[PDB]
């Protein structure tokens, strides 16, 4: 169910997420809600690379309660 996700957009800063794909999709939708250009899209990161994301401070975690309060 849950995975690390890399969320990218042309000419934009990469974002990083941990959680379910339903939650990464809600997150991407909120990121794009007012993006006229260079919209974001997510890709699921294979477990082989997961160490390079675990504990990272730029990874928004959907498994934390209230992570989506700003939505």
Numbering used by the authors: 5 to 75
What does the paper say about this structure?
Anti-CRISPR proteins (Acrs) are naturally occurring inhibitors of CRISPR–Cas systems that have been identified in various bacterial and archaeal species. AcrIC9 is the most recently identified member of the AcrIC family that inhibits the type IC CRISPR–Cas system. Analysis and comparison of its structure with structural homologs indicate that AcrIC9 belongs to DNA-mimic Acrs that directly bind to the cascade complex and hinder the target DNA from binding to the cascade.
AcrIC9 was successfully crystalized as a single crystal diffracting at 2.4 Å under synchrotron radiation. The crystal belongs to space group P3112, with three molecules present in the asymmetric unit (ASU). The final structural models contain residues Met5 to Ser76 for molecule A and Met5 to Glu78 for molecules B and C [Fig. 2(a)]. Since the electrostatic surface features of a protein are sometimes correlated with its function, we analyzed them to obtain information about the working mechanism of AcrIC9. The results of this analysis indicate that the surface of AcrIC9 is highly acidic [Fig. 2(d)]. Therefore, this highly acidic surface feature may indicate that AcrIC9 is one of the DNA-mimic Acrs. Moreover, the long α2–α3 connecting loop and C-terminal loop exhibit a relatively high B-factor value (average of 54.3 Å2) compared with the low B factor (average of 40.2 Å2) of the overall structure. This indicates that although a major part of AcrIC9 is rigid in solution, it contains a relatively flexible α2–α3 connecting loop [Fig. 2(f)]. We performed SPR spectroscopy to confirm the interaction between AcrIC9 and the cascade. As shown in Fig. 4(c) and Table S1 of the supporting information, AcrIC9 binds to the cascade complex with a KD value of 4.32 nM.
